[PDB]
Amino acid sequence: QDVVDLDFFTQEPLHLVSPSFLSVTIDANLATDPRFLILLGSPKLRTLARGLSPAYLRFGGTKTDFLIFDPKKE
Amino acid sequence: KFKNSTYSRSSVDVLYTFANCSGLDLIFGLNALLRTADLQWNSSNAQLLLDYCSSKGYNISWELGNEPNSFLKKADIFINGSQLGEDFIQLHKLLRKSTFKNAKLYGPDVGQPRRKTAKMLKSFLKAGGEVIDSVTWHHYYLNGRTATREDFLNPDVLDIFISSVQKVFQVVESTRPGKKVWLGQTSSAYGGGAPLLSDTFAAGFMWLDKLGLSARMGIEVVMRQVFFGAGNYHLVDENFDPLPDYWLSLLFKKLVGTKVLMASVQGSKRRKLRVYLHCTNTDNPRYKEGDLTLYAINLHNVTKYLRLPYPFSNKQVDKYLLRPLGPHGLLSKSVQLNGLTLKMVDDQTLPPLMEKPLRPGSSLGLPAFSYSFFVIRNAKVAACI
Numbered sequence A: 001q002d003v004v005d006l007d008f009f010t011q012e013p014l015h016l017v018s019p020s021f022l023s024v025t026i027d028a029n030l031a032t033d034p035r036f037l038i039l040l041g042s043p044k045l046r047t048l049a050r051g052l053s054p055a056y057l058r059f060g061g062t063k064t065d066f067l068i069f070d071p072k073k074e
Numbered sequence B: 001k002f003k004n005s006t007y008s009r010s011s012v013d014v015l016y017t018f019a020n021c022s023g024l025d026l027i028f029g030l031n032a033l034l035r036t037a038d039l040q041w042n043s044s045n046a047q048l049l050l051d052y053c054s055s056k057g058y059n060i061s062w063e064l065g066n067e068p069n070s071f072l073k074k075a076d077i078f079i080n081g082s083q084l085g086e087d088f089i090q091l092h093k094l095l096r097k098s099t100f101k102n103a104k105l106y107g108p109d110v111g112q113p114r115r116k117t118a119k120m121l122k123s124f125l126k127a128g129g130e131v132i133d134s135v136t137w138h139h140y141y142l143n144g145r146t147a148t149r150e151d152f153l154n155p156d157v158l159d160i161f162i163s164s165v166q167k168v169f170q171v172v173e174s175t176r177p178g179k180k181v182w183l184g185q186t187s188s189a190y191g192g193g194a195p196l197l198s199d200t201f202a203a204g205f206m207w208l209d210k211l212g213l214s215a216r217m218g219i220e221v222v223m224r225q226v227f228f229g230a231g232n233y234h235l236v237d238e239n240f241d242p243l244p245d246y247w248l249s250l251l252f253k254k255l256v257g258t259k260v261l262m263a264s265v266q267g268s269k270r271r272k273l274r275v276y277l278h279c280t281n282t283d284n285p286r287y288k289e290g291d292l293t294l295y296a297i298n299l300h301n302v303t304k305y306l307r308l309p310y311p312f313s314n315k316q317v318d319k320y321l322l323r324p325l326g327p328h329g330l331l332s333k334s335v336q337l338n339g340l341t342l343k344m345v346d347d348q349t350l351p352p353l354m355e356k357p358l359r360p361g362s363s364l365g366l367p368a369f370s371y372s373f374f375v376i377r378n379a380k381v382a383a384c385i
């Protein structure tokens, strides 16, 4: 009743994903947090991020289109 | 609701160093709402950033705009897909004149393919498709405000993703055949995630299923919204603690290879027992060329027992079964792998991910409301060597 037979296709790859298939984002809005430097400097966080390498890190989100680079700002 | 903000060189450095130190490849979304009088993209600010990044030796890939389908609602500006394509061509010329002349460019980061979004994507690919390296689109299943527990467990909700993927490939094949298609931003639920759901074990059914369907259907890269941040759908919470979807993601990374295969269940119930098959990840030291990685999701309320087909029926199989740590069941923020709670050894040290070797020839047990990986050792699959 609860036993199920699996069928497998194994003759050739049907697709090839990137080695970075499982990637991640950081929302653009996070750069508006005053503690952004502390957050992304965290050694604990970087250890967790390293576990997902290789991967893309996409910085973007709704705030992407409301962020302006200012070379003068400290 | 959305106001202009500025960001500094420090912020750019914080982001790049995070990525660089973590072995990640940074993709930076440029602001597409900087517009000239004739609604051309004004590239002056982007030029400032490109120059700065080139000055620091930052190897960065680029995007331009996020969800341009929504610009009218968000900013009372409508940019059609043809114009956006031109804007991308102009960004591409800037990249070709920079120190990283071969930098990659992705876009247009449209939402999932409703009528008006599909139209915008089509006109964008017609106009600007030659300069993009991959096509990016976004997906969410549900509104996080109203999503239910029931929805997170519903095959009818999981299945809606299939039609979105089909619609994107239909646009791409009609305009830029063979161009790589990426999910550029994706998660369970929008509005920052579904409270008490998108950060729990229950979130893993959508996440693992999305990965399995994406790989099976031809999507090359899936970008999870978010690694870290304010929304519920984060992989890591505001205390820097990993949530169940982080551990699921780490296991997927360690076990699942690049070469995608196919599994299906006989009797053709395609709904609540969901199965995926790849070659095993060749970087995993424990396994060898030719091994297979099966992963499976059981949305039934009873345990199911899976039987492997010839010639794999008697192979040694390594089980990696994920179940929540109680007392909160599917709504738990803690997970166990083969009965061992997953947690960091210390701030510098991920734990080992310990397999459970099964009795060769045994059926693969998958409890109710659970998901597991199974590595088939010495599978000797030629396609995987």
Ligand SMILES: [N-]=[N+]=NCCCCCCCCN1[C@@H]2[C@H](C(=O)O)[C@@H](O)[C@H](O)[C@@H](O)[C@@H]21
Pocket: A027, A060, A061, A062, A063, B066, B067, B111, B112, B139, B140, B141, B142, B143, B185, B189, B190, B191, B192, B193, B231
């Ligand atoms: N079902 N469905 N999905 C389509 C309905 C429209 C999507 C909702 C509008 C908001 C989308 N909004 C998503 C996300 C969020 O709301 O969580 C936010 O953090 C990101 O910054 C954005 O790029 C994107």
Ligand SMILES: *[C@@H]1O[C@H](CO)[C@@H](O)[C@H](O)[C@H]1NC(C)=O
Pocket: B035, B036, B037, B042, B043, B044, B045
């Ligand atoms: C683009 O924006 C800059 C900075 O706001 C402005 O000074 C410049 O004149 C604009 N360029 C065009 C071509 O409209």
Ligand SMILES: *[C@@H]1O[C@H](CO)[C@@H](O)[C@H](O)[C@H]1NC(C)=O
Pocket: B025, B059, B100
């Ligand atoms: C930038 O990084 C990518 C990914 O590692 C690499 O393939 C590319 O060749 C790099 N380009 C340069 C100029 O270093």
Ligand SMILES: *[C@@H]1O[C@H](CO)[C@@H](O)[C@H](O)[C@H]1NC(C)=O
Pocket: B038, B039, B079, B080, B082, B083
């Ligand atoms: C798209 O928008 C541009 C810029 O406003 C305009 O000049 C062009 O005619 C529009 N194209 C279509 C097909 O509406």
Ligand SMILES: *[C@@H]1O[C@H](CO)[C@@H](O)[C@H](O)[C@H]1NC(C)=O
Pocket: B301
């Ligand atoms: C268990 O699932 C069956 C469908 O196979 C359903 O009819 C029954 O109501 C379920 N039991 C519970 C407690 O949800």
Ligand SMILES: [Cl-]
Pocket: B079, B080, B081, B082, B119, B120, B121, B123
């Ligand atoms: Cl359009």
Ligand SMILES: [Cl-]
Pocket: B129, B130, B176, B179
């Ligand atoms: Cl092309």
Ligand SMILES: [Cl-]
Pocket: A027, A029, A030, B228, B229, B230, B231
């Ligand atoms: Cl955030």
